[PDB]
């Protein structure tokens, strides 16, 4: 972590060396607690790898991406799992997600135990353990997305929890983490989700399009620079 934080990656490398740097930085973050940046760097890497070869590399990044997203309370998409190059290499993770959605600690324990040595071999076991105590998070994010205001007692009923104070506390910690956007108000006893703000009216669109325009002009300058007219070679 110190080494990476101190040296600077040159901005002109291959696709492959960029992919390797990105994988290692993603792994190092995921091992620490900055999940979101790890997710982002990983997806950049997977989007920068060679298309055809590197079956093992794709396997590596995909399994780590699955684990990190799960750790983030989102649900990774099912499209990949049936891809031929990663079908049988992720069955552990397929069962794992089937478990994380319909959270059943019995099923989570069954799958972790059975496919245990494999997880350890991958080099992730620690993270899947970090998940096992965060299975609730998916449910609370779902409850927030679905409801614009719910009573805390309703949350307790929905999460198969003990007295509604436990759910109260979990929701408060969540909103603290930033996974959900809401505001708790117990004097009536309901957690209230925050409205939707208009992104366009702000200045975000201008910034995004400016960045992309700069990239395009740079592409052009490079492209016309690369030309060599050697007919007088």
């Amino acid at each position: 972590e110190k080494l990476v934080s101190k040296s600077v990656f040159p901005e002109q490398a291959n696709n492959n060396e960029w992919a390797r740097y990105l994988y290692y930085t993603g792994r190092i973050k995921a091992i620490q607690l900055e999940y979101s940046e790890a997710r982002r760097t990983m997806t950049n890497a997977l989007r920068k790898a060679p298309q055809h070869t590197a079956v093992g590399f794709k396997q590596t990044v995909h399994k780590l991406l699955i684990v990190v997203e799960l750790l983030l309370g989102e649900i990774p998409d099912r499209l990949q799992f049936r891809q031929p190059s990663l079908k049988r290499s992720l069955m552990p993770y397929f069962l794992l997600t089937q478990a994380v959605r319909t959270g059943n600690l019995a099923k989570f324990n069954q799958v972790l135990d059975q496919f245990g040595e494999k997880f350890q071999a991958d080099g992730t076991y620690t993270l899947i353990i970090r998940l096992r105590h965060n299975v609730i998070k998916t449910g609370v994010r779902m409850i927030s997305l679905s409801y614009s205001r719910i009573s805390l007692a309703d949350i307790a009923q929905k999460l198969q929890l003990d007295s509604p104070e436990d759910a109260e506390f979990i929701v408060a910690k969540a909103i603290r983490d930033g996974v959900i956007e809401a505001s708790i108000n117990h004097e009536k006893g309901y957690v209230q989700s925050k409205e939707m703000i208009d992104i366009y009216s702000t200045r975000e669109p201008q910034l995004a399009f400016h960045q992309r325009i700069s990239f395009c002009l740079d592409i052009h300058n490079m492209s016309v620079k690369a030309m060599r007219f050697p007919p007088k070679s």
């Binding site: 669109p205 201008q206 399009f209 400016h210 992309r212 325009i213 395009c216 002009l217 052009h220």
Partner: peptide
């Protein structure tokens, strides 16, 4: 901006 981005 969207138009200039498309142009580029």
């Amino acid at each position: 901006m969207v138009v200039v981005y498309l142009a580029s």
